[PDB]
Automatic annotation (TrEMBL):
Top EC class, one word: hydrolase
Record-given protein name: Peptidoglycan D,D-transpeptidase FtsI
Gene Ontology MF: a single term: peptidoglycan glycosyltransferase activity
Biological source species: Pseudomonas aeruginosa
Keywords on record: Carboxypeptidase, Cell cycle, Cell division, Cell inner membrane, Cell membrane, Cell shape, Cell wall biogenesis/degradation, Glycosyltransferase, Hydrolase, Membrane, Peptidoglycan synthesis, Protease, Septation, Transferase, Transmembrane, Transmembrane helix
Catalytic residues as annotated in Swiss-Prot or TrEMBL: 244 (acyl-ester intermediate)
Length: 500
């Protein structure tokens, strides 16, 4: 009475972590539908079927009566096999059974922002599920079915074309590192009364994003009553002024200029500096002469500004642009922001000073981590990747190996020297990094670093949004998170200790 071609759903590819742990799995679910044309000939069966579907008798009957002309309506999607057989056993004419695919996410909220989710039609709508949708979805088949003049699926003819299953995808993320970072960022938020946060971990040798976690987060397996703020992958889609965490790059421009060495001295007394109506102000103001390492340890805005006036903002802009701040990462992640590294024909003094200590530009947590990776990797930037990297692509030298080496040594002193950020110290290793405290009377606390300082393997960025306890400095709020997560990450990757 009617020959028709209908789609065959393809099996969606498995997403694993870098070691094969499942992160997104296509699982069979039982969906029930009905042909109202057939139901209309068995009305005396409707109340038992309605009750079986948890439905009010009258509302069910109103539904079928309204659709009496159509030949298809869903009844309920995604049931257990025991549930569907429970209904089919009633043998109600025109009630049919189907098996579909539905994603399950074994790690739930721990990796929701990176993995994303699919819709009820099994299409990728967010995160990796969307970015890699063509790779994961495969290609539907087609089959030929005969249907009588009332919609009854009389015969089932051949398969015209088989479905092509999707392909497996292994991410760069290490699920063991991801759990640790997730736990500790969460603990830090709760201990500090903070509103939001991000943590990014990167392999400085391969470009791999080993961990990417945010708060708040959500359970992708139960998205009822989902708050869209809980769904933001802040590490990639939120932009912020990085503040003093960019001082290592200002310093890289200074050491490359020919005009400065770490033992050179800047006079920062009295801890402020007027630029017209604008006033640069240090956080501690009992200093006069400081050497370049001292400027980083004390995080003196006056110090880095006087250095910036000497070498010119253009050279600072250039290093920041070369390491990727405010530049397109090329990951193609949905909603991923680029930020902004402003430019000028001639840089005014005030813009020059603020650029040098990280105001006036916008970056993401992932760009900041990638810039620190380039610095840890002896000045060579390796392309970012969200998937496991087997053949490493060639990187670009963006800071000279000698300059990067020197800046690494200074940042090890930031963490280890007297008056330094002692809370970022990693037991059994040497660590290097810089704190940040940036306006947003509310602040973001930041720490960016890498370890082991002797032979760097891992770069990490911690951002904690609006800590509400008395201490809000990056060195008080974010540095201890770096310490706990870096220690766990190095242990898990069996990195040999360089400080025992
Ligand atoms: Cl943008």
């Amino acid at each position: 009475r009617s020959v028709r071609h209908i789609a065959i759903p393809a099996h969606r590819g498995l997403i694993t972590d870098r070691n094969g742990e499942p992160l997104a799995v296509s699982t069979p679910v039982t969906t029930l539908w009905a042909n109202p044309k057939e139901l209309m000939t068995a009305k005396e069966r409707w109340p038992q079927l309605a009750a079986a579907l948890g439905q009010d008798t009258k509302l069910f009957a109103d539904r079928i009566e309204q659709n009496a002309e159509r030949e298809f309506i869903y009844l309920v999607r995604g049931l257990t096999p025991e549930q569907g057989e429970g209904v089919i056993a009633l043998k109600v004419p025109g009630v049919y059974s189907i098996e579909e695919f539905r994603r399950f996410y074994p790690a739930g909220e721990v990796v929701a922002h990176a993995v994303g989710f699919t819709d009820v039609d099994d299409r990728g709508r967010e995160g990796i599920e969307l970015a890699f949708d063509e790779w994961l979805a495969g290609v539907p088949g087609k089959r030929q079915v005969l249907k009588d003049r009332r919609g009854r699926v009389i015969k089932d003819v051949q398969v015209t074309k088989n479905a092509k299953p999707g392909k497996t995808l292994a991410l760069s993320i290490d699920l063991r590192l991801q759990y640790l970072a997730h736990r500790e960022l969460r603990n830090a938020l709760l201990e500090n009364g903070a509103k939001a946060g991000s943590l990014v971990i990167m392999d400085v040798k391969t470009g791999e994003i080993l961990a990417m976690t945010n708060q708040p987060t959500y359970n992708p397996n139960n998205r009822r009553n989902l708050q869209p703020a809980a769904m933001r992958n802040r590490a990639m889609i939120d932009v912020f002024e990085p503040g003093s965490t960019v001082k290592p790059f200002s310093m890289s421009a200074a050491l490359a200029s020919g005009r400065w060495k770490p033992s050179d001295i800047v006079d920062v007394y009295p801890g402020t500096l007027q630029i017209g109506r604008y006033t640069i102000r240090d956080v501690s103001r009992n200093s006069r002469q400081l050497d370049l390492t001292g400027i980083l340890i004390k995080s003196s805005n006056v110090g880095i500004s006087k250095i910036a006036f000497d070498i010119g903002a253009e050279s600072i802009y250039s290093v920041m642009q070369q390491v990727g701040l405010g530049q397109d990462t090329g990951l193609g992640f949905p909603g991923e922001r680029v930020g902004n590294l402003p430019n000028h024909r001639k840089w005014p003094k005030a813009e020059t000073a603020t650029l040098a200590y990280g105001y006036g530009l916008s970056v993401t947590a992932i760009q900041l981590a990638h810039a620190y990776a380039a610095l840890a990797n002896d000045g060579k930037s390796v392309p970012l990747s969200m998937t496991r990297v087997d053949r490493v692509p060639d990187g670009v030298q963006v800071i000279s190996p000698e300059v990067a080496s020197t800046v690494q040594g200074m940042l090890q002193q930031v963490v280890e020297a007297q008056g330094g950020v002692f809370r970022a110290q990693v037991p059994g290793y040497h660590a290097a990094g810089k704190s940040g405290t940036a306006r947003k009377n509310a602040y973001r606390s930041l720490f960016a670093g890498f370890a082991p300082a002797t032979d760097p393997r891992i770069a990490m960025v911690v951002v904690i949004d609006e800590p509400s306890k008395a201490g809000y400095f990056g060195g008080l709020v974010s540095a201890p998170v770096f310490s706990k997560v870096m220690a766990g990450a190095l242990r898990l990757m069996n990195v040999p200790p360089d400080n025992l």
